[PDB]
């Protein structure tokens, strides 16, 4: 079921999970919840998501509560500003510490509670 895009395979889940249970599922398949580091990757993901919400590898880290990628890609605040839905991250209820892809637009990301269940997207490097 994995889809190939620019040197990576992607798994769009059929079953919803909390953010961490999803990450654990990805890790069990030698992958991680997906990072997003280019407009073309953002586009590939939101087009494939077809208007549905999917957990991605976005999650808060450090005392500052800075966003980070679970796959350890450094998070680039400047280059990522364009990828959030206007108004997000809005940290609703002081309890939105993980990130999903929501809107079918380059401006797609939202922060939501880690314990909410959504479909999720794993990313796995292809190694020739
Ligand atoms: C107890 C409760 O239901 N609280 C509501 C909040 O969830 C909600 O805050 C919004 O939550 C959405 C969730 O989007 S999601 O991807 O489906 O998880 C967005 O994150 C949005 O940014 C938040 O403002 C507020 C507003 O609808 O209503 C509360 O009652
Ligand atoms: Ca939010």
Curated annotation (Swiss-Prot):
Tissue expr: Exclusively expressed by Langerhans cells. Expressed in astrocytoma and malignant ependymoma, but not in normal brain tissues.
Taxonomic path: Eukaryota, Metazoa, Chordata, Craniata, Vertebrata
Subcellular location: Membrane
Shown segment, full-protein numbering: 198 to 325 of 328
Protein name: C-type lectin domain family 4 member K
Effect ascribed to mutating residue 91 to D: Significant reduction in mannose-binding ability
Protein species of origin: Homo sapiens (Human)
All residue ranges annotated as the C-type lectin domain in the record: 5-123
Subunit structure: Homotrimer.
Medical condition linked: Birbeck granule deficiency: A condition characterized by the absence of Birbeck granules in epidermal Langerhans cells. Despite the lack of Birbeck granules, Langerhans cells are present in normal numbers and have normal morphologic characteristics and antigen-presenting capacity.
Outcome recorded upon mutating residue 67 to R: In BIRGD; abolishes mannose-binding ability
């Amino acid at each position: 079921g994995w889809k190939y895009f620019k040197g990576n395979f992607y798994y769009f889940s059929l079953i919803p999970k909390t953010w961490y249970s999803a990450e654990q599922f990805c890790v069990s398949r030698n992958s991680h919840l997906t990072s997003v580091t280019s407009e073309s990757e953002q586009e590939f993901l939101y087009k494939t998501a077809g208007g549905l919400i999917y957990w991605i590898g976005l999650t808060k880290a450090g005392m500052e509560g800075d966003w980070s990628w679970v796959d350890d890609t450094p998070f680039n605040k400047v280059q990522s500003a364009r990828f959030w839905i206007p108004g997000e991250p809005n940290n609703a209820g002081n309890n939105e510490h993980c990130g999903n892809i929501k809107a079918p637009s380059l401006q797609a990301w939202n922060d939501a509670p880690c314990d909410k269940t959504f479909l999720f997207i794993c990313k796995r490097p292809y190694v020739p």
